[PDB]
Design a protein around this nucleic acid. Structure first.
Ligand SMILES: Nc1ncnc2c1ncn2[C@@H]1O[C@H](COP(=O)(O)OP(=O)(O)OP(=O)(O)O)[C@@H](O)[C@H]1O
Ligand SMILES: [Mg+2]
Lengths: 302, 77
DNA sequence: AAATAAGATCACTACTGGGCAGTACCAGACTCGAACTGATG
């Protein structure tokens, strides 16, 4: 059914929290971006970069998980005979402690996530970490991943140099050129500081269709909330958009905070003050809106 | 968490350190990593765990040791 | 333009993985000196 199971009420509160924490709503933007990404992955058109943007809270990471699972289950019939054929590899970029992005650490973490043995015993067979670089190139050629996801790709820009900001990506460019591995760099709007471009747009209040979609996802969130009495939430859609700006990801964790607080008190419904207790700060939303406005203005070029 | 700690080992409820004002003009991330590792692991029984770094390991007395040769991202890992 | 930063390079120091030319053993196995023995013209 479209609603949450009614048998979880007798179950302990931890079970209800675990059930709600794993519910991933398929809003139209998420599935549209998923279809675009799947179409790009299936036929790359000779491209080697699938840059994807979106302010924090759009749902990029869950989109990555969905694409990972879908590609793994799509390949599943053919890995029974073919081994060393990991379908998709997804890693998260490291924020450098120094002023410049570290590429040795990136190479070693990419090798670790591929379960490549003997990383400490690599050799260079005739740049940063040539041995690790060649090892990662060979691992990508032979393991043959369909896509190489790099979440938090905005940390690649930590170089503090205009003449090196674009050149910091030469390592990934050369690694994708000579191994033929699709690199899908998921990042926030900082990634626009620099190839297929995908936009994970939020639900801007100017367009009524986005308002309708936000109310739809809000209603389907309220339906799946495990309380004895279904809490009315669509009435304060204006409030739920003020502290969220239209991102379906931070709405989910806001509702998670409120639901956990309700369950810990053995409550039965959600009121306005419950949401106010675990709402985002007034200044936090202002900073988020400033950053998203800068990103939208950067991407507004036609 | 004490009943859960008794039931299940290899579990710390809360870990806490204090940031250090640096003697130099920049914050020391290597010291932060090594002191967080010391605080997290030293007040534990010898529960054999292998971190994915060559240098860092336990000793006979149980006190964790980090070589000065260990590079900071390895400590972070 | 002079002054102040900062990365690059050379040089030295301390630390910690860690392998190659070489020896030794133990029966299983193959090949053929040397001989043994029977059929034959
Ligand atoms: N559509 C969704 N439905 C349900 N939960 C979601 C959804 N999108 C994100 N989440 C939840 O949000 C968390 C992951 O962060 P989220 O996807 O919101 O941020 P992101 O903007 O994609 O990532 P980041 O800010 O790190 O780049 C998880 O707890 C996940 O369950
Ligand atoms: Mg994320």
């Amino acid at each position: 059914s479209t609603g949450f199971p009614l048998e979880l009420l007798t179950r302990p509160a931890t079970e209800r929290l675990a059930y709600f924490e794993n519910y991933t709503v398929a809003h139209p933007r998420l599935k549209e971006v998923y279809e675009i990404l799947m179409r790009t992955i299936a036929e790359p058109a000779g491209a080697s970069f699938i840059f994807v943007y979106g302010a924090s809270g759009v749902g990029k990471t869950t989109l990555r998980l969905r694409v990972e699972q879908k590609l793994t289950e799509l390949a599943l019939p053919k890995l029974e005979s073919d081994r060393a054929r990991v379908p998709v590899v997804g890693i998260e970029a490291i924020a450098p402690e120094s002023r410049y992005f570290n590429w040795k650490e990136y190479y070693t973490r990419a090798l670790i996530t591929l379960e490549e043995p003997l990383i400490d015993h690599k050799f260079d067979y005739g740049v940063v970490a040539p041995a690790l670089r060649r090892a990662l190139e060979n691992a990508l050629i032979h393991r043959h991943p369909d896509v190489f996801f790099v979440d938090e790709a905005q940390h690649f820009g930590k170089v503090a140099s205009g003449y090196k900001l674009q050149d910091q990506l030469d390592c990934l460019k050369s690694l994708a050129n000579m191994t033929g591995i699709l690199h899908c760099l998921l990042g926030t709007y900082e990634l626009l500081t620099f190839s297929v471009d995908i936009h994970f747009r939020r639900y801007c209040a100017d367009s009524p269709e986005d308002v309708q979609a936000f109310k739809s996802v809000l209603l389907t969130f309220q339906q799946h909330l495990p309380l004895a009495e279904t809490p009315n939430l669509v009435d304060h859609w204006e409030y739920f958009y003020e502290r969220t700006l239209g991102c379906i990801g931070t709405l989910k964790d806001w509702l998670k905070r409120v639901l956990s607080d309700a369950l810990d008190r053995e409550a039965t419904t959600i009121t306005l003050k419950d949401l106010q207790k675990r709402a985002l700060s007034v200044a936090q939303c202002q900073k988020m809106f400033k950053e998203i406005q800068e990103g939208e203005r950067q991407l507004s070029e036609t | 968490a004490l009943p859960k700690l008794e039931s299940d080992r290899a579990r710390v409820p809360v870990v806490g350190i204090e940031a250090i004002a640096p003697e130099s003009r920049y914050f020391n991330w290597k010291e932060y990593y090594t002191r967080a590792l010391i605080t997290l692991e030293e007040p534990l029984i010898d529960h054999k765990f292998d971190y994915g770094v060559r240098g860092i390991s336990r000793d006979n007395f149980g006190k964790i040791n980090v070589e000065s040769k260990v590079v900071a991202p390895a400590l972070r890992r």
